[PDB]
């Protein structure tokens, strides 16, 4: 399967509403996984299968969509929210993941 | 409280041998999924090899025939023989513990290995 | 499905006890009596509305017709004093009686 | 049947300042294998509730990092870090130990 | 068969208990077995029953949903877990065999071999 | 995940009614059920819950006997019987799912999700 993250260079000011959106080619609908990591860091998860808020993830990070479609949203940014953004394919054979955006507090 | 250790990476000549250490605190590698991740520079994520919970094996297209994942039930531990190894190998390798619908709870901070 | 006996019946010590349990189509069920001497767990006495089982004398005589079950003790003595429990078995259902207490003077 | 009584009946406090309800159970609640069956409900103003804390000190998916709960064997308390403006609304305990499941009266944390 | 009970004891409206009455012989793998509990002012009340197989279990109207009656035939002991323990629960129990194997013969029988009581009493 | 509870209305005394919980977005396969009541201003109160595939059917004494619940699990709906409504059980009516799906996650304890609920007035 190939995952197509959208767009891969990101820029927004403190406050901002952000989408960021990986496109599923095919249509799974439940198999997401956001991976935010800190410039030359340790990945975290964000929203595991998709909508649900992984503990301990602070309440401002919302992710939606099902199916062919999905999108992380972030409700007001803060200026350590640069990372760069990876999705996952989960329940799968190869793990494909997308190929990264880059959220700069700009 | 859970936390990997990695170790075993290095500079090595093209084709060499080589073997990585994932140490684990906490979850019990022998009955777990787990997986080995590659990062080469100026790239992002990718999938290497996954050893099930059972003791079944897992390796990618680009691994096949290269790699060997390996464990140890005395110390805890998850290795990967790491064997002819071309200019493409030369990356930062992470192990991640695989719960399926459930994402890469916990990772490992990182080894960079080095082709040269 | 409910079986009734008597609160308690008496009689004097040497005469003939009667002590009856009624039921809807009781006639047509078999039914079991049990002694339950105070202090005492309760033992069978009567069963299959005519048949009485090995260790107990004949005195005990139990009979079973239309609509009422009859347990009859000729002889009473001193330790017949006790309570006296109809059974009945319907739809595999255990439903015990009232249990008439009996007194013997 | 376990009746459980909360302390106090109404805690109105200022935003910003911290805020404990108490609420102790009549019998023992501990040990049903090894925890304490005591849960936290919020009822928002107008809205349904959902969990706050299970287990007595432990909470569920996505809950604020200002709540949490402590006491063991009757005394019980929820220990909010930091009262703000989305936190009115009436708390709620539950022994989650016999069949009878009974909640609290309701004990509202308001800005006054 | 000689049977004993045990269990027996103080809890709290709602709790748990397990009762149990064990027999000294073998034979017990032949009878079926019912739960008969004795009020502390009145006589006795039928609890539940169990076939000699295990496999044919029955309970009073006022009772299903809270026990649940369990033998061993290898292990010569039977059983009644006793959940809900309610107001008007507490008694004294008597297991009793019934002979017949099946639920369809237990009316050509009755109850003859009762073991001694055990005391179950549920109050705040 | 989303708890779509039906029916309720305005409805007889002593008369009856049927509700729904019409469950999806999870398993409800292996997960338990709740159902709680509130009557105006009164507090949230416990009526009933299921296991994972019925036959575990737990109530109050309020609700002995008067109240029966079911559910489908081929559909995924949540069931309740209602008879003989007294005054008493005028209330929103919330289902709710147990947090979990093993053992000693009491079919009767922690209550993860809830709905919306539905308002059943008994009156005339």
């Not at chain 3, 017709?65 to 017949?80: C, F, K, P």
């Not at chain 4, 969990?51 to 604020?64: C, D, E, F, H």
């Not at chain 5, 009644?80 to 309610?86: A, D, E, H, P, V």
């Not at chain 6, 309740?80 to 799906?101: F, H, I, P, W």
Request: hydrophobic share 30%; proline share 4%.
């Amino acid at each position: 399967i190939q995952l197509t993250q959208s767009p891969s260079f990101l820029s927004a000011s403190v406050g901002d509403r952000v989408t960021i959106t990986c496109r599923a080619s095919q249509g799974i609908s439940s198999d997401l996984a956001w991976y935010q990591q800190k410039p030359g860091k340790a990945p975290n998860l964000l929203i595991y299968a998709a909508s649900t808020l992984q503990s301990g993830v602070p309440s401002r990070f919302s992710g939606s969509g099902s199916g062919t479609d999905f999108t992380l949203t972030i409700s007001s940014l803060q200026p350590e929210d640069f990372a760069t953004y990876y999705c996952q394919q989960l329940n799968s054979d190869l793990y494909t993941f997308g190929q990264g955006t880059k959220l700069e507090i700009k | 409280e859970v936390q990997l250790v990695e170790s075993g990476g290095g500079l090595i000549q093209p084709g060499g041998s080589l073997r990585l250490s994932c140490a684990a605190s906490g979850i019990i590698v022998s009955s777990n999924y787990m997986t080995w991740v590659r990062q080469a520079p100026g790239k992002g994520l990718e999938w290497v090899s996954v050893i099930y919970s059972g003791g079944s094996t897992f390796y990618a297209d680009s691994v096949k025939g290269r790699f060997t994942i390996s464990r140890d039930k005395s110390k805890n531990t998850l290795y990967l023989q790491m064997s002819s190894l071309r200019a493409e190998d030369t990356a930062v390798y992470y192990c991640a513990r695989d719960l399926g619908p459930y994402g890469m709870d916990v990772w490992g901070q990182g080894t960079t290995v080095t082709v040269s | 499905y409910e079986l009734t006996q008597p609160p308690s019946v008496s009689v004097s010590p040497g005469q003939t006890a009667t002590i009856t349990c009624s039921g809807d189509k009781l006639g047509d069920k078999y039914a079991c009596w049990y002694q339950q001497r105070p202090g005492q767990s309760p033992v069978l006495v009567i069963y299959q509305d005519s048949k009485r089982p090995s260790g107990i004398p004949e005195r005990f005589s139990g009979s079973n017709s239309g609509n009422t079950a009859t347990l009859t003790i000729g002889g009473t003595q001193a330790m017949d004093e006790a309570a006296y429990f109809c059974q009945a078995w319907d739809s595999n259902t255990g439903v015990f009686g009232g249990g008439t207490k009996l007194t013997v003077l | 049947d376990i009746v459980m009584t909360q302390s106090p009946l109404s805690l109105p406090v200022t935003p910003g300042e911290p805020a404990s309800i108490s609420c102790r159970s009549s019998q023992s609640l501990l040990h049903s294998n090894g925890y304490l069956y005591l849960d936290w409900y919020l009822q928002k103003p107008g809205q349904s509730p959902q969990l706050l804390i299970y287990l007595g000190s432990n909470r569920a998916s996505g809950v604020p990092d200002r709540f949490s709960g402590s006491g063991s064997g009757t005394d019980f308390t929820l220990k909010i870090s930091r009262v703000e403006a989305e936190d009115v609304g009436v708390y709620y305990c539950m022994q989650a130990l016999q069949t009878p499941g009974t909640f609290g009266q309701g004990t509202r944390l308001e800005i006054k | 068969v000689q049977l004993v009970e045990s269990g027996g004891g103080l809890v709290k409206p709602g709790g748990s208990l397990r009762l149990s009455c064990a027999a000294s012989e073998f034979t017990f793998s032949s009878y079926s077995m019912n739960w008969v509990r004795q009020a502390p002012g009145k006589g006795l009340e039928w609890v539940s029953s169990i076939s000699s197989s295990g496999s044919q279990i029955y309970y009073a109207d006022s009772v299903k949903g809270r026990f649940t009656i369990s033998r061993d035939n290898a292990k010569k002991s039977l059983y009644l877990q006793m959940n809900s323990l309610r107001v008007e629960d507490t008694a004294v129990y008597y297991c009793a065999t019934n002979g017949g194997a099946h639920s369809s013969t237990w009316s050509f029988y009755g109850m003859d071999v009762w073991g001694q009581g055990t005391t179950v009493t549920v109050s705040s | 995940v989303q708890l779509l509870e039906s029916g309720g209305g305005v409805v007889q005394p002593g008369g009856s009614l049927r509700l729904s919980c019409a469950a999806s977005g999870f398993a409800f396969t292996t997960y338990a059920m709740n159902w709680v009541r509130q009557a105006p201003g009164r507090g949230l109160e416990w009526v009933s819950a299921i296991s994972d595939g019925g036959g575990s059917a737990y109530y109050a004494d309020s609700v002995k006997g008067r109240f029966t619940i079911s559910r489908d699990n081929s559909k995924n709906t949540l069931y309740l019987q209602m008879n003989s409504l007294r005054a008493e059980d005028t209330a929103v009516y919330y289902c709710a799912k147990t947090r979990g799906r093993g053992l000693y996650d009491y079919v009767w304890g922690s209550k993860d999700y809830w709905g919306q609920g539905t308002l059943v007035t008994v009156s005339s």
